């Protein structure tokens, strides 16, 4: 039965300062690398990761590392 895979572009531990400090549209710096290491998570758990790829109707992550 249903289980929600999440495709997480980026993760960051944040506290309130930076949290307000970004609720104001501050640029959170990513690498250009970003889309090659997309993370796949299910329940707040890290199953694997990979590379954003296109198949022009849809996006896909091609798996690099899994479990």
């Amino acid at each position: 039965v249903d289980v929600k895979l999440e495709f997480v572009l980026y993760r960051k531990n944040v506290t309130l300062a930076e949290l307000e400090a970004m609720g104001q549209q501050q640029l959170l710096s990513l690498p250009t690398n970003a889309e090659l290491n997309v993370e796949i998570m299910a329940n707040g758990v890290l199953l694997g990761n990979g590379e954003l790829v296109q198949m022009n109707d849809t996006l896909g992550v091609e798996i690099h590392e899994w479990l």
Binding site: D2, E6, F7, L9, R11, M41, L47, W66
Partner: protein, 62 residues
Amino acid sequence: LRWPLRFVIGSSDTQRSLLGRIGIGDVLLIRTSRAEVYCYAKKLGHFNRVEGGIIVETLDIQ
């Protein structure tokens, strides 16, 4: 102190059996494209992919 934020760009509500026939080199379709900031299982606001980074629009925390 700190809050882990996932910047999520889509989700694919899979089910049971596929994991784990899933393996290296396979591709997972993003069947729902989004652009969202979670803290744990809680939706905060919409961000979007820009410049050389990200900007988070509303950020609702309560």
